[PDB]
Write a protein that holds these residues in place. Structure first.
Motif, PDB file in Angstrom:
ATOM      1  N   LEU A  34      19.416 -26.308  30.599  1.00  0.00           N
ATOM      2  CA  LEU A  34      20.338 -27.157  31.425  1.00  0.00           C
ATOM      3  C   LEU A  34      21.207 -27.908  30.698  1.00  0.00           C
ATOM      4  O   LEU A  34      22.320 -28.083  30.969  1.00  0.00           O
ATOM      5  N   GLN A  35      20.627 -28.867  29.517  1.00  0.00           N
ATOM      6  CA  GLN A  35      21.405 -29.895  28.914  1.00  0.00           C
ATOM      7  C   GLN A  35      22.874 -29.058  28.310  1.00  0.00           C
ATOM      8  O   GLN A  35      23.816 -29.668  28.684  1.00  0.00           O
ATOM      9  N   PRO A  36      22.582 -28.258  27.262  1.00  0.00           N
ATOM     10  CA  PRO A  36      23.713 -27.430  26.703  1.00  0.00           C
ATOM     11  C   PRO A  36      24.675 -26.970  27.959  1.00  0.00           C
ATOM     12  O   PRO A  36      26.018 -27.067  27.690  1.00  0.00           O
ATOM     13  N   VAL A  37      24.221 -26.328  28.914  1.00  0.00           N
ATOM     14  CA  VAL A  37      25.278 -25.884  30.190  1.00  0.00           C
ATOM     15  C   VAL A  37      26.127 -27.004  30.545  1.00  0.00           C
ATOM     16  O   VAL A  37      27.082 -27.007  30.908  1.00  0.00           O
ATOM     17  N   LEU A  38      25.189 -27.993  31.119  1.00  0.00           N
ATOM     18  CA  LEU A  38      25.599 -29.184  31.726  1.00  0.00           C
ATOM     19  C   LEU A  38      26.703 -29.748  30.721  1.00  0.00           C
ATOM     20  O   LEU A  38      28.136 -30.305  31.138  1.00  0.00           O
ATOM     21  N   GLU A  58      26.683 -39.231  26.776  1.00  0.00           N
ATOM     22  CA  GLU A  58      27.256 -39.557  25.537  1.00  0.00           C
ATOM     23  C   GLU A  58      27.653 -38.508  24.794  1.00  0.00           C
ATOM     24  O   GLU A  58      28.585 -38.897  24.227  1.00  0.00           O
ATOM     25  N   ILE A  59      26.840 -37.561  24.641  1.00  0.00           N
ATOM     26  CA  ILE A  59      27.114 -36.315  23.881  1.00  0.00           C
ATOM     27  C   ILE A  59      28.524 -35.826  24.232  1.00  0.00           C
ATOM     28  O   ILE A  59      29.503 -35.648  23.554  1.00  0.00           O
ATOM     29  N   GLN A  87      25.509 -29.126  18.566  1.00  0.00           N
ATOM     30  CA  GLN A  87      24.440 -29.235  17.789  1.00  0.00           C
ATOM     31  C   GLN A  87      23.324 -30.187  18.265  1.00  0.00           C
ATOM     32  O   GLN A  87      22.157 -29.962  18.273  1.00  0.00           O
ATOM     33  N   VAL A  88      23.957 -31.162  18.640  1.00  0.00           N
ATOM     34  CA  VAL A  88      22.994 -32.378  18.838  1.00  0.00           C
ATOM     35  C   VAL A  88      22.346 -32.158  20.563  1.00  0.00           C
ATOM     36  O   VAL A  88      21.122 -32.230  20.448  1.00  0.00           O
ATOM     37  N   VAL A  89      23.358 -31.577  21.284  1.00  0.00           N
ATOM     38  CA  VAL A  89      22.721 -31.394  22.679  1.00  0.00           C
ATOM     39  C   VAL A  89      21.586 -30.355  22.535  1.00  0.00           C
ATOM     40  O   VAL A  89      20.539 -30.465  23.435  1.00  0.00           O
ATOM     41  N   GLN A 107      16.174 -28.977  22.951  1.00  0.00           N
ATOM     42  CA  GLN A 107      14.830 -27.811  22.593  1.00  0.00           C
ATOM     43  C   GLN A 107      13.745 -28.613  21.931  1.00  0.00           C
ATOM     44  O   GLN A 107      12.703 -28.199  22.457  1.00  0.00           O
ATOM     45  N   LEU A 108      13.915 -29.593  21.396  1.00  0.00           N
ATOM     46  CA  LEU A 108      12.868 -30.635  21.135  1.00  0.00           C
ATOM     47  C   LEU A 108      12.025 -31.213  22.392  1.00  0.00           C
ATOM     48  O   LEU A 108      10.748 -31.287  22.258  1.00  0.00           O
TER      49      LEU A 108
END
Length: 433
Positions: free
Chosen positions: A157-161, A189-190, A206-208, A213-214
């Protein structure tokens, strides 16, 4: 090169303007009568004509019928879903708002991939950055490929978003709308850092990817965030009874004077949410969210400083208002420490909305699939005696040029400049007197 719009997409915007009494309405009435009577004037030629030429309106249409229905309606001062109206009374200082989770729906980027070249080229460029850090294809997940992973999964979700929000900002920029600043909520904020240039694409990607993934490895099952429509003080008093042995529940964000988020343990969150719903108060678990912005992030501190040690920050084109430390950041201050504060600290969105009012922002563009922070900005504006425009981009099941030109009209009708002629690029239309 790449245009707002595929040449064969039928959705086109017709902009009309007036300053004298009944001038907008009269110009609409006459044009609708002329369109039906002339039977020779091209619809495309009239569009580019209207697009190239204080009270404003845009007809959003896919068809001559929708054009007559819109001008007809504007002509008789009747409201219509496809005629966006306003007064041009705003300075136009603009801030792009990048929210967190809550925006997502199942077909969200699909329409704009298929019908907006500009969006498609940005989407690829940003997908390409994330895909350097990931085995799967962003574009296939958006199109719901059978073999591609699901959006339910936080780490997807987060990388897609992230990609959709950054690509939507580029679609706004092509149509001639350009932030003077950015503001992010949570992961947002990313995306805000990518658009401002404060992080390179590859760094922000890379951050998102690594931080989601963490969260997936370490926090899924154990926590969530819920949106509650009450002010902070009321909510502190409703969670106290859950937090006897241990702090299961804590205030993770301030979005408006009557609007907060709660983060922590899934069962206690769901009980509070059910309690408040039974009482007629809006409380909702935000989809796929983990318990970020709470003590659950603390056992991850050193892992997160190590994971994001790569990050190289730098001045962006445009400032970032920090929802994390109330500072206006040039972009160089966004080191791994910042990205720990971002996932641990509660999001003080509402106070930076008031700071943006005071620095002369009166137009807030939320660069998202569905508007979620727009209500909070409007509630803040009302409580501050400020007239501001809080504008979303897409909504659920409306991800097309019709929705986007509607939101673009929203900003134009209130005084922000827009290149409407961009919508007719490559169609072989000609301006006709």
């Amino acid at each position: 090169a790449p245009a707002l719009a595929e040449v064969l997409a039928p959705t086109v915007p017709w902009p009309l303007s007036g300053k004298n009494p009944g001038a907008l309405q009269g110009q609409a009435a006459r044009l609708a009568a002329h369109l039906a009577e002339d039977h020779d004037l091209s619809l495309s030629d009239l569009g580019l004509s209207l697009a190239t030429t204080e009270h404003r309106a845009v007809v959003v249409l896919g068809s001559r019928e929708e054009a007559l229905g819109g001008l007809g309606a504007l002509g008789e001062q009747m409201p219509a879903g496809n005629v966006v109206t306003g007064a041009a009374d705003l300075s136009g200082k603009t801030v792009f708002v990048f929210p967190g989770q809550g925006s997502q729906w199942a077909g969200m980027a699909v329409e704009l991939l298929d019908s907006s070249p500009v969006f498609a080229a940005r989407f690829a460029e940003v997908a390409g950055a994330v895909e350097a850090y990931v085995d799967w294809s962003v574009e296939s997940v958006v199109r719901g490929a059978d073999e591609a992973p699901s959006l339910d999964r936080i780490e997807i979700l987060q990388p897609v978003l992230f990609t959709v929000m950054v690509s939507l900002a580029a679609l706004w920029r092509a149509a001639g709308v350009v932030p003077d600043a950015v503001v992010g909520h949570s992961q947002g904020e990313i995306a805000a850092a990518a658009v401002s240039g404060a992080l390179s694409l590859g760094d922000a990607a890379q951050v998102v990817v690594l931080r989601s993934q963490l969260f997936a490895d370490e926090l899924v099952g154990k926590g969530a965030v819920a949106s509650v429509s009450l002010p902070a003080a009321e909510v502190e008093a409703r969670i106290a009874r859950f937090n006897g042995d241990a702090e299961l529940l804590s205030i993770a964000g301030n979005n408006g004077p009557r609007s907060v988020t709660v983060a922590g343990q899934v069962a206690a969150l769901e009980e509070l949410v059910a309690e408040l719903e039974a009482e007629g108060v809006r409380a909702k678990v935000i989809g796929s969210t983990v318990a970020s912005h709470c003590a659950q992030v603390d056992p991850l501190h050193e892992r997160i400083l190590d994971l994001l040690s790569f990050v190289q920050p730098r001045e962006g084109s445009v400032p970032l208002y920090s929802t994390v430390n109330g500072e206006v950041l040039n972009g160089a201050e966004l080191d791994a420490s910042y990205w720990f504060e971002n996932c641990r600290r509660p999001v003080s969105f509402e106070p930076v909305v008031r700071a943006l009012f005071a620095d002369g922002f009166d137009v807030f563009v939320e660069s998202s699939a569905h508007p979620v922070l727009t209500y909070g900005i409007s509630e803040t504006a009302e409580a501050a005696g400020r007239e501001v425009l809080a504008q979303g981009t897409l909504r659920r099941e409306e991800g097309g040029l019709a929705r986007f030109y509607s939101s673009l009209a929203g900003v134009w009708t209130r005084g922000v400049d827009v290149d409407w002629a961009g919508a007719f690029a490559g169609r072989g239309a000609r301006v006709v007197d």
